[PDB]
Amino acid sequence: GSRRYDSRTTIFSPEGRLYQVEYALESISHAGTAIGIMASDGIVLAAERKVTSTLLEQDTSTEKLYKLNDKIAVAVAGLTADAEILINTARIHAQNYLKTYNEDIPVEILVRRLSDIKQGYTQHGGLRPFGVSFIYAGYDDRYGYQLYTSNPSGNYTGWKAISVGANTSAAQTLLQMDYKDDMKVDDAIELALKTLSKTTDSSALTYDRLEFATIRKGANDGEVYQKIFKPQEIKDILVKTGIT
Amino acid sequence: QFNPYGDNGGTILGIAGEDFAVLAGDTRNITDYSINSRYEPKVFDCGDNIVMSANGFAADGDALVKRFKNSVKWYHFDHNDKKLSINSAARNIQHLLYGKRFFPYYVHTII
Amino acid sequence: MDIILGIRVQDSVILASSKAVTRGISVLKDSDDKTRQLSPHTLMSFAGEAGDTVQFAEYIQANIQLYSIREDYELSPQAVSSFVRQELAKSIRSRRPYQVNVLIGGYDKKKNKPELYQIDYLGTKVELPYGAHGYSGFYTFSLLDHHYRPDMTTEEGLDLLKLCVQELEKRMPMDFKGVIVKIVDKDGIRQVDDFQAQ
Amino acid sequence: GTGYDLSNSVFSPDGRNFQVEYAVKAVENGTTSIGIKCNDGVVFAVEKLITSKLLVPQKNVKIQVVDRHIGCVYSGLIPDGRHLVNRGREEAASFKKLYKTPIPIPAFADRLGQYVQAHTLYNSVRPFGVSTIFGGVDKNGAHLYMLEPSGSYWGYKGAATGKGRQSAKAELEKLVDHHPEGLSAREAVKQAAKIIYLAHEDNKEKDFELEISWCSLSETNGLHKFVKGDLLQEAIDFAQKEIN
Amino acid sequence: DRGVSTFSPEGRLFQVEYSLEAIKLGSTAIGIATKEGVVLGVEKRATSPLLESDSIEKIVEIDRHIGCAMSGLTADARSMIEHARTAAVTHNLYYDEDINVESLTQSVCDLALRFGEGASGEERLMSRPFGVALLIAGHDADDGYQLFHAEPSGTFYRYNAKAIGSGSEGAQAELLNEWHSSLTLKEAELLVLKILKQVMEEKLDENNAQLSCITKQDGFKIYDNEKTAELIKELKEKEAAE
Amino acid sequence: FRNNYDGDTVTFSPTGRLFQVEYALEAIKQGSVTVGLRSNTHAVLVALKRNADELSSYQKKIIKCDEHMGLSLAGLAPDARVLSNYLRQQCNYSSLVFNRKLAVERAGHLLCDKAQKNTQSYGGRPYGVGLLIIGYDKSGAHLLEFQPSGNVTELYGTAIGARSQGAKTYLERTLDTFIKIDGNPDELIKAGVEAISQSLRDESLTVDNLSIAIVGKDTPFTIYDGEAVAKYI
Amino acid sequence: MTDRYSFSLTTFSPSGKLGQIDYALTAVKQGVTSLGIKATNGVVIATEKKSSSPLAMSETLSKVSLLTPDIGAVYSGMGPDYRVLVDKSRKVAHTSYKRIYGEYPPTKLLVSEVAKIMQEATQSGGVRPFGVSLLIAGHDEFNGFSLYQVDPSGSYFPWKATAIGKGSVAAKTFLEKRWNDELELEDAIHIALLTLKESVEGEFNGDTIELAIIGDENPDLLGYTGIPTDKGPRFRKLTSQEINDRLEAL
Amino acid sequence: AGYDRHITIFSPEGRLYQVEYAFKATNQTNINSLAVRGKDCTVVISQKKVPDKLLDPTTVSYIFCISRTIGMVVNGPIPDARNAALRAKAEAAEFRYKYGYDMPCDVLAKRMANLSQIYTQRAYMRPLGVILTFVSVDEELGPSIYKTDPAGYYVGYKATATGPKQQEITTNLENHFKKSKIDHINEESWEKVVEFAITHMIDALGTEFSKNDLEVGVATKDKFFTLSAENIEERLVAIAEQD
Amino acid sequence: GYDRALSIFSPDGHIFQVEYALEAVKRGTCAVGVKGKNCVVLGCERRSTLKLQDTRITPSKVSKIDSHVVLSFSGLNADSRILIEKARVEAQSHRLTLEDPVTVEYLTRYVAGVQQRYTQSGGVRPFGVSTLIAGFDPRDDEPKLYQTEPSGIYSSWSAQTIGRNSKTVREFLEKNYDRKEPPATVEECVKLTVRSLLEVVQTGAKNIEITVVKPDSDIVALSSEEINQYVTQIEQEKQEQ
């Protein structure tokens, strides 16, 4: 029969752990580091591009920062292709919500739905889980700025500052060291770059190896704006923050 | 257009005595103004001391009586040859008929 | 059809709905409350096809209460009305459509303003100062067009409705057996037990 | 490595399908049966081992008819044989229903062929545990066929399978040489009864019952019929006589 | 691995046999059938003193004339009870009468072998056999009082008395010597109470054990604690009497 | 060896064997003995009912499939229920649609085919029960032996179950004798009981332990248990 | 029957590797070299026609395929896998885009579609990942020219120039030396020919080499006239002759 | 782990053993075949070997008439060959019904190759242990030979050979074309092309053939047919009067 | 399509997947519940493997299934969500058809059923979760506390705990909870609860959350201070000796 070749991707270990989830997490741990920092006036998403070449087109590239809504975005750590599958369904769920209630979807509701999808691949179906971890940066009129994280297990949590991917241990310790509740978006942007800068497995931290995004409520307006920095924009902020 | 129903005439009568009961019926089967048969039994012995007749549209009457007899057979198979009481047959027949509530057996049945 | 009326004043929404339930030749009940509370600050009145009417109302009520529990939050009146419109807009193209018309009166605690939504069985939604379904609008809209003011007090709104009901009781052929009136404001939903002679 | 013989549709390093080969073993372990093509028909005969006196004689018929002009006999797992005939019957009814004319032997052979071959395509099914000799008369002649568990089949002059296939094949080859002009239905029936008696030596331990059937344009009108009474006994004798 | 409906070289279904092992680990349950009714008793066996014993329901009603006791993975018995209650009620709706105890039992046993990953016979969607055995007891006009033992194998046996669960080999031996064709309902009660006491790890009292019966006159009844406590006392006295 | 080829029915062993089927056949051997024999007017089934405890009942081993057909089982009772129920329907179908009683030979063919499907596909399992079918149809009295392998055979008599070999040798000897017990049921039955006792060892056939069934010329398939079999002990 | 393989054939190992993706990539490594170079006014993709026999007709086998009139693809790895990926790509360009918006999809989106098809063969039940890496070149009004690589995992990335397969490491290095952001299409073609020469063992000519470009519109390749807005495909496969002419200026 | 050799999933080397072993199966029949293109015809030769004396020689063939115009010769076990033939005939018929014209040889080839590619990717389907050589005189392409294997690969050939001694035939043919400098047999009659085919078959295999040792198929404008033992004998006689 | 029997019997009569499901529960943060004379209190401990969380938004351990019933758990968080959603849906359905909210036992029997079902259905693993469900039946003032586990088994408790070190805290409760005189006060009940958690939480003002459920949908969660105050008064009881 077929049973012979079934890996059984959804069983418990004698210790009560989920093999595939643990292995997927192990996979994620080798992915480019992504960081999320929540400030009083905004949110920052920063990510290190794993592997790069002189010939890689960076102007037309995006492998870690994706817009889900006009008020929600995510940073990806893991299999890009798996991420895109989830990203797309997330984009649809947001629209369904909007059409149903004529209100943008609350950040947690969208995060919970995506995590629930992940949880599924964990309990039934016999399929491998998605080798992906997300850092969600969004805003809604009930909780304002929010920062979430979800991993292969389908579990999610809220943060003031957090990281996913490689060297999270080191990154977390550094963030837990310099983060302060009254921080400002600009302070946060600097903290993010500094943190990545000290955790990079690479020589130096150049602009061609970074993706940056911020969700701020531009004072001169009254609405929420998402800014996915352009190569030159990252290059700029890199010099200013004193990393040249 | 096609009419799934027909009328074969006939009249049946059931009278319950104190310790007996009779179920009678003429033996004439018709179609419009023609006689199909002067002798076509319409009242049947269904076992377990139960007699039944489903009058009206003969094709429907036959189907029903046939389905009921088969019900008695399986009642025995499924309940250690227990005898099907007349009241139990009656309830059973109700379900047989109601099963076709939206495409009825065009008959007036009496047991 | 039954009388379904609604008016949005300064700080509340008022819904008036006939109490009679007529089946054929007889008036079976004269104390029918054609309303369902969808949430502490949202009320929905309805009129239409015999069984569909309550089945729809209770179905919507169940869904809103479920959302409230899941999110530990109360959806805005506008959000609730869009959900209801979509449900009706689906139904209209289904095997057997819900023949139900509704008025949704809610007090938005975030905006601190009352809101009245009119939605027919086709999923046709509109927001208004006052509205109705059926023939009700035919007898009352000329009165509302005249005496309505955005700054009316709840008491003024009740007086205007009373006038509307009187016109209905004079010119309408059917005896709808009066109306049950309910107020929806910042403090919730309450019923005016005294309109039989206010 | 190994284990190539545990699942049905698996190719071994030498390109074989071991499960099909093991099926063949079940076939060789079965009663011997044969088929002889004559000048205007075909004859089928089989060995029926009499396990005990308790077996009602002549009752457990093994030869089966398909449509009205085809005979089928087989060696191996009897149930598998019936299964294959039931299919052949649906296959024949389908063909007649659509084309009006009864199914030609070649066409029929392939219907059985594709079905048997089908059971060597997946590991969710087991190959057929029988070799089947079948045939009949059609629009242009008589036809004899033998079908292996692999789905392989060819047209034959004579054919045999089961315990004593070698003896039978040997005898059949003689006939072929000593009768280039063609045997007659009448003769084939006797010849067949003999071949079976002879081939019974490879199982001379248990007593047996002979069964023959034929389909001759002149003897049966092109319809398949069982050899009974006088014609049967006459053939029994012809064999019993030449066995000494 | 190996199919869940595979035969052992001895001609047994592994899953069914392993199922019987789980049943051995369950709490004890005993049934005694007399011409005056059938008694059904069970060992509550709470796992902690903080557990409210009365919430342990190992004896349930199927219909007014049928009750049943379970032993083993008790959670697996909920759908069995549900199917049973539905079969009995359904039978009544279709025939305006009570379903025979044996019929009810056969229906429950029909679920038994409906397990597998795609067994060619119908649509047996259930990954494994039930891990609980049941004692079905009741009364009907054709065969009077009856006690049946329904196993995850699908077979069911009628017994005059029967014990299932951890202390079954022992308790059954006892029942063998204690049962006779003229036992009274009261004798049966005391008898069930006594055997439970012998095989139970804990000292039997009205909180860790429960009795019930079914009589033609009053149907299936679960004895409240007060009622059983007295029967306990009555047993202690008759034993100390010799 | 075996261990690598007996995991499921869809696998042939290197010698061309189907172990799962053989293991199923083993469940029959572990089953209580039952006998079947017929003359030209009747067919009889004699079965030894087995009990669990002395507080338990002796499980029924004879099932009626129609007024002219029935069988005895040896092995997994549930499987007998499934197969006999299929036979009840087939008989029933024959009556309702063609107003024809189903030929015992045809019933044998249908059973063979039903059992075969569970020996060539993944996921299922072979039936683990043996059956002896008797019946009186348009060609007289009949007795059939059904094996889970799908092999069905017509005989004058036979036996299956534990120690069945005793009764079988007895019948193979008594053949010329009982085959002529026409017009006398009691004689055929006694002959059957004599064959079955040829497989005893443990105890002796008692009243609530013996089970008999007969069908014939003017006899609708009927079962005798207890008091009704006393006149044969 | 019935595919009973409803579970994944690609799962995570303790180290976190996805075995089958890895193995698929290894199959790609053994494949013939193929490359793509983006110029300021076009893109070129090329590979070697490794004829498996001189009796074979290398023209009847195209390693460079047109997906849309402005997008082409080439690969390295398992040819049969590529062939079906191309059928699916051409079709998805229609079903998921042209039949909706009345226009062909932009390069990145079609690439995104292909990538999805590949990602699914990495997680769906009963299948193995595709044993290929594609290089897709195209042009669209709002993005201009672009070049993408799609791997067995479904991942894709934009390139200025790159190579895949057998001698990809060396070839990528040679490309890094010759590439600049002021290259004209002819220059890219020339660089492409040079890079491919290092990878070819035997004959090197227009019959053993397969090359196509994404450049200006070819109104002569439209097939009709009358619609001012329809100017022709930007995709064009070079002819054996066109290649040799450029090989002399090698 | 070691099961990467039972189903069609990649091995650590990125190989598909099952597809490789399926290739092994193609030589199981120990038969060799070859195809050449004429000026306006296509010929396919294939050894015919009937060992058993009890077989009806007329029913032993590895050449099939797929459509009025397409011919196909198979190298591999007959049951898998007949599976391919049935499918090819059905595909050929359906194509005509849906698209209004006869399915081209190369298109049928691609179609069958794609089907093969799938058994290569889906675990529940095993590859067929055969190599299919399709021939015809396409209305657009002229004489055509397209061959497919268990890997799902296919391509057009000027001429080709398949079987155990495939290599010897191939090099023989290669040499001839290196000499002639053209990609077909410049002969106007298919009879002579068939003769060329057999001649080189003999040279390369170093064997003589009787009329029952061969099997021949010819494709011409609007028709594909196989020769009879006698049509063949006439062919053998002609080549004899040259050597 | 996937229907592999993941939960099956082993030779000794065990179902390892259900057994390992329990092991996941032992690994979860501790949860406790104790019923007073007129209330029920639910306590949960807060892990500290990582601290820098946003408590406002991070999902809480106690969930309301309806206005009169709550559910807490120990085990896989992602798994608990599935059970909670189904429970909430079933609560509304019950109100819609029976025109009365669910009793606590009914809601419990429902969740347990879902759990049992996932132990004998093909293609799915059991829930790595155990739950404590508490509240008051409609129009009833008698407190209710139930517990469910992966197998699908459930029962009511005077007090119970689940999760890591639940062994420890259960002992505390077994020799600190008198059925004769249950915490006759919301206060003394919450205290006994905090005390039992302190036996394992090891000084965790922000690592201990409590929720108080009273009759008629009166449910409220305490704030750090309110709890922290209980802790303080408790550490003194010790030192004052």
UniProtKB/Swiss-Prot annotation, chain C:
Keywords: Acetylation, Cytoplasm, Nucleus, Phosphoprotein, Proteasome. Pfam families: Proteasome. One of its GO terms (molecular function) is endopeptidase activator activity. The keyword Cytoplasm applies. The modification Phosphoserine is found at residue 76. It is found in: Cytoplasm; Nucleus. It comes from the Eukaryota. InterPro entries: Ntn_hydrolases_N, Proteasome_beta2, Proteasome_bsu_CS, Proteasome_sua/b, Proteasome_suB-type. GO terms for biological process: proteasomal ubiquitin-independent protein catabolic process; proteasome-mediated ubiquitin-dependent protein catabolic process. CDD domains: proteasome_beta_type_2. GO terms for cellular component: cytosol; endoplasmic reticulum membrane; nucleus; proteasome complex; proteasome core complex, beta-subunit complex. The modification N-acetylmethionine is found at residue 1. Transmembrane segments: none annotated. Present with 21800 molecules/cell in log phase SD medium. The 26S proteasome consists of a 20S proteasome core and two 19S regulatory subunits. The 20S proteasome core is composed of 28 subunits that are arranged in four stacked rings, resulting in a barrel-shaped structure. The two end rings are each formed by seven alpha subunits, and the two central rings are each formed by seven beta subunits. The catalytic chamber with the active sites is on the inside of the barrel. Belongs to the peptidase T1B family. This is Proteasome subunit beta type-4. The gene is PRE1.
UniProtKB/Swiss-Prot annotation, chain D:
Transmembrane segments: none annotated. GO terms for biological process: proteasomal ubiquitin-independent protein catabolic process; proteasome-mediated ubiquitin-dependent protein catabolic process. Its main location: cytoplasm. The keyword Nucleus applies. It is found in: Cytoplasm; Nucleus. GO terms for cellular component: nucleus; proteasome complex; proteasome core complex, alpha-subunit complex; proteasome storage granule. Keywords: Acetylation, Cytoplasm, Nucleus, Proteasome. The alpha and beta forms are probably products of the same gene with different post-translational modifications. It comes from the Eukaryota. One of its GO terms (molecular function) is mRNA binding. Present with 12000 molecules/cell in log phase SD medium. The proteasome degrades poly-ubiquitinated proteins in the cytoplasm and in the nucleus. It is essential for the regulated turnover of proteins and for the removal of misfolded proteins. The proteasome is a multicatalytic proteinase complex that is characterized by its ability to cleave peptides with Arg, Phe, Tyr, Leu, and Glu adjacent to the leaving group at neutral or slightly basic pH. It has an ATP-dependent proteolytic activity. Belongs to the peptidase T1A family. This is Probable proteasome subunit alpha type-7. The chain holds residues 5 to 248 of 288 of the full protein.
From Swiss-Prot, chain G:
Belongs to the peptidase T1A family. This is Proteasome subunit alpha type-2. It is found in: Cytoplasm; Nucleus. PANTHER family: PROTEASOME SUBUNIT ALPHA/BETA. The proteasome degrades poly-ubiquitinated proteins in the cytoplasm and in the nucleus. It is essential for the regulated turnover of proteins and for the removal of misfolded proteins. The proteasome is a multicatalytic proteinase complex that is characterized by its ability to cleave peptides with Arg, Phe, Tyr, Leu, and Glu adjacent to the leaving group at neutral or slightly basic pH. It has an ATP-dependent proteolytic activity. It comes from Saccharomyces cerevisiae (strain ATCC 204508 / S288c). GO terms for biological process: proteasomal ubiquitin-independent protein catabolic process; proteasome-mediated ubiquitin-dependent protein catabolic process. GO terms for cellular component: nucleus; proteasome complex; proteasome core complex, alpha-subunit complex; proteasome storage granule.
UniProtKB/Swiss-Prot annotation, chain I:
Its main location: cytoplasm. It comes from the Eukaryota. The modification Phosphothreonine is found at residue 58. GO terms for biological process: proteasomal ubiquitin-independent protein catabolic process; proteasome-mediated ubiquitin-dependent protein catabolic process. It holds the Pfam family Proteasome. GO terms for cellular component: mitochondrion; nuclear outer membrane-endoplasmic reticulum membrane network; nucleus; proteasome complex; proteasome core complex, alpha-subunit complex; proteasome storage granule. Keywords: Cytoplasm, Nucleus, Phosphoprotein, Proteasome. It is found in: Cytoplasm; Nucleus. Present with 16800 molecules/cell in log phase SD medium. The 26S proteasome consists of a 20S proteasome core and two 19S regulatory subunits. The 20S proteasome core is composed of 28 subunits that are arranged in four stacked rings, resulting in a barrel-shaped structure. The two end rings are each formed by seven alpha subunits, and the two central rings are each formed by seven beta subunits. The catalytic chamber with the active sites is on the inside of the barrel. Interacts with CIC1. Belongs to the peptidase T1A family. PANTHER family: PROTEASOME SUBUNIT ALPHA/BETA (PTHR11599). This is Proteasome subunit alpha type-4. It comes from Saccharomyces cerevisiae (strain ATCC 204508 / S288c) (Baker's yeast). The gene is PRE6.
